[PDB]
Amino acid sequence: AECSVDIQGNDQMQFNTNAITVDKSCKQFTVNLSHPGNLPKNVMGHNWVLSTAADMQGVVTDGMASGLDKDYLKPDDSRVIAHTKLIGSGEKDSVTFDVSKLKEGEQYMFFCSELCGINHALMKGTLTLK
């Protein structure tokens, strides 16, 4: 209605939006992730992870160290503002976070941290508080 957004990650390593706006009147904001298509989480798995644009490379690098068993994310990574679980086709996950964790004027990025293929890296977008 205003404080949530529906995002799909499909079999072609596509997200359906590459830019999310959070309205500052929202106390909390919700991302409902799903995965169109047929491919399971081991071959074409996606999640949804939110960090500042600045923190993303570090999140990715450490996440990579943490590896597959952790969905390539450092557990409890203080730089991840919010994240979903990993999903494969026919699966769904929602995550709610406090809008107070954002500020205006900052650049946020959302992305799939799960290595899922040739266009895995394009499964990203911006998020902005307004």
- Residues of this chain that interact with Cu ion (CB under 5 A) are 46, 112, 114, 116, 120, 123
CB of 65 to Cu ion, least distance (A): 17
Which residues belong to the annotated binding site for Cu cation? Answer: 46, 112, 123
- The rounded distance, in Å, linking the Cα atoms of 21 and 95 is 16
The smaller minimum CB distance to Cu ion, of residues 39 and 127, is found at 39
The smaller minimum CB distance to Cu ion, of residues 33 and 112, is found at 112
CB of 119 to Cu ion, least distance (A): 8
Of the candidates 84, 83, 66, the one whose C-alpha atom is nearest the C-alpha of residue 75 is 66
The smaller minimum CB distance to Cu ion, of residues 70 and 120, is found at 120
CB of 94 to Cu ion, least distance (A): 17
Neighbours of 82 (CB within 10 A): 19
Beta partners for 49? 83, 111
Maximal C-alpha separation, the chain: 39
CB of 25 to Cu ion, least distance (A): 31
Burial letters for 28-65: b for 16+ Cβ neighbours within 10 Å, e otherwise? ebebbbbbebebebeebbbbbbbbbeebbeebbeebee
The smaller minimum CB distance to Cu ion, of residues 77 and 114, is found at 114
